[PDB]
Structure formats: structure tokens, C-alpha cells
Inverse folding.
């Protein structure tokens, strides 16, 4: 599978990385080396939906923004995060 | 058939999953793994209509949101779910 | 043959709601019959109650058009009147 | 090897602006550091401040993408914020 | 490397030269014979980014427009014009 670019940050948006990956397994492994998460899971920053498998990952546009967190995580969406900045 | 991405949640919109599938059988099987129902069925979150066969699934846009539930479920639609957040 | 398209079908009371894929009126009626065992199921536009009388009329309609399934010679309750009747 | 691509690099204050050809993130950072002497240079997207974390990400980007070169864990001023303050 | 055509002008954009070159070194050398600059450098007319090496030059389309000026130049770019209007 081809290498694609994705964007990953944590729920507080404290560290922001562009990461290249050709599978969900690779993207999680690269995220795990960057964030203090022992069981990392990837969620859409837009609506909090969990990227549950490699097939869903590859259905997304390149450069999609993900929140990395733990399993079954409460995710602060982009809209919620901006609203909380006021 | 090609893999396409879809979104699945429960009627409470609590747990939310993006799932890739190339058929309705595969989408239901993957949804059942996350939502252990005896007879899982998929419904449009927009209007509650049941996705009754693979041909209907393939007629929908990728990234469509579905509510997973049992058979003959009465789904809370997007519009009524928001309004319930209002109350 | 003809392309598969998605349609929506419900009964006159709007109790059970199905998205159904079909490539002909014959196929759409056969699938509707499995969900609503009426002896001679017929499809009517939910918008204005006009009976889908042949496959050429069906193909003249947009995908995702909503139909009411009922018996023959049925005057169905249109969407406008159904929405009104609960208010 | 990997082909040369053109990229654009400036600093957080947009004081000097360079088009740079590179075939790897390692090369792009080295050429950027020649122009902007920094102890621990990293590249960040000028659009949203996301850090270019590896060569695979760099090569996923369109040619002529604009980067801010800065130190580590940097909070760079995005294009939108910089233009906003410029108009202020 | 193949010869390509480039457009070079000054910051006023009134001394305008089409120049053929197969390297940044050649393009600068030819521009220097036309322009009053001790150390000519090439900048994109669109956004002012300096052509820092031959690899960057070769990444650009033929007939790209450059402003030639000195080092650390103050360039009036197309973006600078769009900003004013």
C-alpha cells in the first residue's frame, strides 16, 4: 500500500505531528512513539468517530486530522475545542 | 466490490466507529463485533430507514452515518436526537 | 442490464421503513412484498399518492424517492397530510 | 534514489524566504539550517503548525509546500495568524 | 541538463529579459551581465522566495518570472500587490 500523510494531535492539542504511514498499524505505532499512550487509538478530530480498522483509514482523504487517545476515549471535537477556547 | 468507509453508532450516539466494508454482510459483521446484539441491523441516522440489503447500502454516499440496533427498531433520528439534547 | 438504484419504502402508517435497492419495478415490488406480505403489493409516491404503474415510470423518478406500499386501488395518505395529521 | 523536489522555507518571523530543492527530510533540514542557524532545527507546516515528523510525511506533501523552520516543540505562528497580526 | 527559458526583471518590473539557461549558475551569470548588481540573486515574482540552489530552479516551470536583486532584498511581490488591493 502507498505511503500517505496524516495529521495527529492529542486531545489538548499540545503536540501536533504530520506522520506518513501506509497502514493503520504503522500510523498507530508511529503515534505511540510520539505520545504517552500505551494503547493508542485514533479518532476523527471532526466528530470523534474511532478509526476502527485499516479499511476505514484508507477510505479517508490524505491529511485528515486525528486525535490520538486511549480506548473508548471521550474525544473533544474540533468544534468543542474551539468553543472551549473562549 | 471496493472497500468504502461508513460511520456506525448506537441510538444514544455514545460509542462511535468508522468502519470500512465492501458489503452489507461485512459492515454488519464488523458492527456486531463492537455492539454485541443478537440480531444487529443498520438504520439511517437521518431518517431511521433500515438498510435492508447490500444494493441499498451501495446506493448511499460513503461516510453515511448508521444507527445499529436490533430488528424492527424505532431509531431516534438526527433531528429528534438534537432536539432531545435541547430538552 | 439496468442499474441498481436505492429507494425508500414504508407503509401508510409509516410504522416500518426500509431502504431497498432495485434494478426494476418488478424487483422493488418483490422485495417490498418480503417486508409487507400484502397479497398484491403496489407502490405509490408518498408525495402525491400516484401509483408507480410500470418500470418506465419508476426509472423516471429520482433515486431515494419514498414510496408507500399498499394494496391495489389504494388512496394513500400523502406526506403532507400525514405530517399535518399529527400536528 | 529519491527525486529532488522544490520546497519553500522561512522562519517564524518571515524575515528571509528560500526555495530549496531536496530529496529527503534530512537534506531539507540541513539546507534550511545553512540559511537559518538553529541548534535543533525542525520543520513545521506554515498553514497549521504541524511538525513534519518523518521523511514519509514530507514526501506526502505537494511540492512547493511552505515550511517554518524552528527549534523543538515550537509553537509557530500560522499563515492566518501572521497575516492577521500583519494587518493589525 | 536541458536549456530552458526564464523571465527575469528588476523590482520595478520595467527592465525585462528572457534568458535561456541550463543551471542556476548560468542564469545568474547571464542576469548579472544585464543588471546593475554586485551580487545578483533571483526571487520569485509571485511570493519573493529566493531561488537558493539549482535543484530549486529545476523544480520550477519554464518561463517562471524572477525578480533579480541584491542579497536580503526587499522584493515587491505579486502577493504584496494583492495585499494592497
Amino acid at each position: 500500500a502507498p505511503m500517505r500523510g496524516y495529521k495527529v494531535t492529542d486531545n489538548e492539542r499540545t503536540r501536533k505531528y504530520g506522520i506518513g504511514a501506509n497502514s493503520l498499524e504503522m500510523l498507530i505505532a508511529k503515534a505511540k512513539s510520539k505520545f504517552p499512550l500505551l494503547e493508542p487509538h485514533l479518532y476523527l478530530a471532526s466528530d470523534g468517530f474511532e478509526v476502527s480498522d485499516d479499511e476505514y483509514l484508507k477510505s479517508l482523504p490524505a491529511q485528515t486530522l486525528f486525535i490520538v487517545s486511549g480506548p473508548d476515549a471521550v474525544i473533544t471535537t474540533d468544534a468543542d475545542f474551539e468553543f472551549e477556547k473562549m
